Design a protein around this ligand. Structure first.
Ligand SMILES: [Zn+2]
Ligand SMILES: [Zn+2]
Lengths: 49, 397, 397, 397, 397
């Protein structure tokens, strides 16, 4: 991540995300807890991105 | 297919223009092209092998793009790159080889492998570039249809053929008349012999002729034509036509008389040369016809007269000959020649991996057998296979 | 002239780098160059032909241009382009061919055709580009009056010459001494024969010598020198010097004694090799001198002794020989060789279009005749004509 | 070293892509690279020569840059440039030559000259660029240690060797049996002779064999194999093994029986061909073994029967032979061949400047001597020296 | 590879510099390095063995670091450490052994095992350090390209060879002349015998010569040369050359006359010594040539005269000899010698685990067979395998 922001994106990520491909992000980050059983059901974790 | 090409000039114009030293800007137009690739790739998976002693390695992708740290590259930049290229190298090899073995009668002019059938896919076309490699240059022009063309030194157009034809013979083989020859590669040697030295022949002249039909037309051929066939200028003991016995050939050489070489195309004389030895040009032909004569010497010193009596036994056999060599030529079809390694590359990869004989090519990719029955299917497969060998040689020799 | 060149690498580096797919920025530096041309052209009229069986197709100009958008290239982009290139292709062909026939005693080194005389014009100069094609690279360096240079595998420096010289002879031709040879292309074979096997010669040794004068200096030559002349190792019936009769040659071969090869330049020995067979280097020479001897064997087994009596008749003729082949060399003047198609291209275009014999070149562009009298005019015309053939082969083979 | 390379493709891709006309943009990526150089240089001082008849020359630097301004290129721009290039040309020449003579046992690989030892310096590395020149492409890969490779037409792998081996002989040399051959360059000719025509041999067959051990492995070889050894098909008077007398060879040729060619690698058969004449592929080998037989004809016409009596004297000597030519092949080590001028360039520069014999190379860079004892030191020095010759030929031929 | 090295000097310079007491600061620079490792490891699983009697032990990682706090190490600190080292020890052993058997004809110089192929990985190189162990010092320099070099004692360059050559013999073997020798390891003993004591020899002197060709060049050799070959100074009954009978050798020793030892390199004399016994230096050679003579004593006391009659039977056989021993030398290639345990380590591990014969090494790692056909593949594999043995011996003997 650091290596991205501190250097702007080329969308490499944009493409991988778009043709919806398996990918990871390294480093520190926020983080949000949630207890909504339902939530999971509305695959929220697939949003934000 | 064209896809494949790029993948290489990509790497060569890469593993070459990328060194510890050059300024970025000398590769800006290059870096770009490169990355573009990486993207399209990562994700999709590939299978190679699955035949004879050919390993089946599975290739998967996952790579980060390329920095830019201005003002000439720092060593550290290279290594983190070479490490990413060496996966593509060791890859492509395993890719070429896989489609460099499969053959197909019906449509054996197109992709066969589970590796390539996926490359011609559309989502990949986004790569093609710098098509200056003589072979691809010609692959394309062929898909649209037009005057293609290749360059060969000492081309390999003549299937090996070494034989004779006795026009006059008898059981004892003591008074023969005929021709013997060797057609092989780019060379022809032919001798006409007359044991009687034309003693009873009209005008004391015996006519000879040798015709060679090429399996493909050659254009713009530079040819050396010389009198005499050294190969048939020495004493020989030869098997008879029926294999039942052996005859004796004891040549004495005379200059070929009224030499005429014709380079014909579809029965028409395109070039004709009368007694011209040295370098001659044959611009377009599918057949060569060599006509020459043995003329009994009208005046003979005693030593000569003694070789040619009026009656048998004929112990010195009058012989006249010609030697013709195609130094260079252009052919619209791929051929083996004395400089290109294509045939050897294809043949070598198949031999090394114990690839089973297929339905198209003769066992061992035998050149004589191949050129003797150079069918459209063999040519399309040969061209595909030669083009791949040439793509491979840009990186792996 | 230099103009002409561009017109091609323009198209090749074009018909090659423009394919359904590729990223634009690999051609930005290219597209530009291209357009520039179109402009300069549009608004000009041209004429080709008007000689022998050569059409007289006429051409006009008025074309569009090209986008500078699109990250990647869409098929539609190509076709609307290929259609515009195919007019330049079919054009240039008709252009090369037109100036590839006209010869001029005077300034045969300059432009001739109504097509080209207009190209050297100044308003066209705004087009030159990428001159790395071995031939143009050399054209320029020459116009600037400087040291040229070329590459040839098995060059064609020796005009065909096959003859003999009898140093000792008599009417019966039963006790001759002399040499016979074949100089052709890049090869020389020479044999020295002495029917008497040096029986009455001082030190029982007969000296031989063969000198060959090149019409142009060859530098950096890699040469194969081998003992024996296979071509003159077999029985022959030959015409006498005056053509009045025929003599008999019945060779038996001995090793050439005291072999010395000298490569001279303007009378000076530049390289000399004493009995060294195999690969030798001759770095700069205009003459080759081969000296060798026949030495009567001082000790002979009965079978050998029987071949060489003290008195005539001499029935086995002692022969010693040498074979020399120039594998590669550099020449400051264009020459035909065993790999390049230039001579064949020029000769072929002239033959196909029934071009009449002109004032400079021998009938049929005959190589032997050309190299035998390689005048400055023939060389300047040959170079112009070879350079054009090479420009043409970048697009049309 | 890699340094050196650039200095050239710099100039070529320069003296070529820069002329009265063209748009800036097609060289923008080029101009830059160029300047970068000038800078690094200016101030630094050099020295070349000082060995044998080699001129010692000192050079300094202090030059202007380039108008990265203008759109087009006006004549005036060129001239003010060519004048600056012609100092680098005449320079590099004097540079190559200087390091193209020094040899060294220990580190025969690395640089030698006071000119180059300063180039490998770090502050100069700021210059590498476009390494598609077949030779550099291979120099690098050799440092990183990996499978390299080169392309050769009629290669030069066989040191000259012309001899014989008498397997059965006697003082009179009237009933011999053995083989004679010529190994040279890329060709082998070998003949097996039996004066008795296998009259007392088991199955009336005499076996022959010829083994040739290459000093380096050849891969992907395209080979021509033909029956008969023309070189040993004519009458000869030869010196005896001990040099005390001479014997007579009077051959009559029969077809070689049970021909088997084996291309071995470390004692293992990699390729084997049984009686296959024409074009064959040997994919990886360090040894060639040719086995062939003379089989007494079971059926003979009178003329033939007369040549082969049951008792001596044996006057016609039965001979069978083979001819093998390596048209092309790949070698991991540099070698001389029939097309490349490297050996000739190195040998020529040394000869022209009267360079004294050194500790590594044989006198005169003699190829036979070199390949016969092709030590690691000779190969490393040869490669360094060949790579430099190739860098030089990009500018000076 | 280099990776592997560290893993050890890590442990040695560890299991050595860590003892109950030592003041911390002797290891600060050490502790660090250590930890760094642990990190890189933990989390990656490993696999070894899988052939013959080689167990397939599996491994895992998850270890606490090492409190760099304390000023003086307390016993408790050690034990909690030794327990963590003993997993790496018992590990590395199982690692070395695994790659100390696998062999490859092609790239038999690089890593093979599923254990090591993963070590050369990039994420691991974060470890390398302190490469002073003679062997690694040399591994690198070789991977980098330069004059390597190892140190020996009574090296093992001569494959065992014990034989004779009879230059004059007859069925009864009662008047022989020839040489017999023993070449083995670093020693050569050769004797020249003449049953006739040069009675009929020119100048009453019989010349002898013994040539030994090394498979690798030895440099900086300290050699002992002594007159006489004790091994061939006693009575023997020997088998005849054809094995059909036995001959009697009854030597009487005389001083070798005109002794000349030449140490040649590629046919050139590098060092020559005339009759110099004791210690001599041969600085660079690939061949040793020993020439010596037997000179019949011109003056003989009765007792001596009685041994050498003018006529047979010859009952006392005059013999002269030499003994040469290479005490120490340097070789650019690994070799077995009289001090290093490498060959024995490799051979022993393979024997203990019943490792099957592979494609590279001779059965049992037989030294004579190995050095006799010391191919590049055997040398690369031997060096890899010797370097690993040396890494192992730093911890396990
Ligand atoms: Zn050739
Ligand atoms: Zn000791």
């Amino acid at each position: 991540l650091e290596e991205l922001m501190r250097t702007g994106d080329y969308a490499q990520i944009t493409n991988m995300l778009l043709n919806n491909q398996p990918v990871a992000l390294v480093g520190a980050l926020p983080f949000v807890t949630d207890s909504s059983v339902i939530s999971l059901i509305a695959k929220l974790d697939a949003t934000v991105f | 297919m064209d896809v494949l090409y790029s993948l290489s000039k990509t790497l060569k114009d890469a593993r070459d223009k990328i060194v510890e030293g050059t300024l970025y800007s000398n590769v800006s137009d290059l870096i770009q092209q490169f990355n573009q690739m990486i993207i399209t790739m990562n994700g999709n998976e590939f299978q190679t092998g699955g035949i004879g002693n050919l390993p089946i390695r599975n290739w998967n992708f996952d790579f980060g793009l390329l920095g830019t740290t201005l003002l000439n590259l720092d060593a550290n930049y290279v290594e983190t790159a070479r490490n990413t290229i060496d996966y593509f190298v060791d890859f492509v090899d395993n890719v070429c080889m896989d489609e460099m073995v499969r053959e197909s009668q019906r449509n054996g002019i197109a992709p066969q492998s589970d590796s390539l059938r996926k490359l011609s896919g559309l989502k990949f076309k986004r790569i093609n570039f710098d098509n200056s490699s003589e072979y691809i240059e010609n692959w394309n022009l062929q898909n649209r249809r037009q005057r293609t063309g290749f360059t060969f030194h000492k081309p390999n157009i003549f299937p090996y053929s070494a034989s004779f034809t006795l026009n006059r013979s008898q059981p004892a083989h003591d008074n023969l008349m005929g021709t013997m020859w060797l057609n092989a590669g780019s060379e022809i040697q032919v001798a006409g012999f007359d044991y009687s030295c034309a003693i009873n022949a009209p005008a004391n002249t015996q006519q000879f002729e040798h015709i060679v039909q090429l399996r493909r037309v050659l254009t713009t051929a530079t040819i050396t034509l010389l009198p005499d066939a050294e190969r048939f200028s020495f004493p020989r003991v030869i098997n008879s036509a029926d294999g039942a016995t052996t005859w004796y050939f004891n040549p004495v050489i005379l200059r070929p008389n009224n030499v005429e070489v014709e380079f014909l195309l579809n029965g028409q004389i395109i070039n004709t040369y009368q007694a011209r030895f040295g370098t001659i040009i044959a611009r377009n032909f599918d057949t060569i016809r060599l006509s020459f004569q043995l003329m009994r010497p009208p005046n003979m010193t005693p030593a000569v007269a003694a070789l040619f009596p009026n009656a048998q036994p004929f112990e010195h056999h009058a012989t006249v000959g010609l030697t013709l060599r195609i130094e260079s030529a252009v052919c619209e079809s791929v051929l083996a020649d004395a400089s290109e390694t294509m045939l050897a590359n294809v043949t070598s990869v198949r031999q090394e991996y114990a690839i089973p004989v297929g339905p198209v090519f003769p066992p061992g990719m035998n050149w004589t057998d191949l050129i003797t029955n150079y069918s459209p299917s063999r040519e399309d497969n040969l061209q595909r296979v030669f083009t791949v060998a040439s793509i491979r040689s840009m990186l792996v020799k």
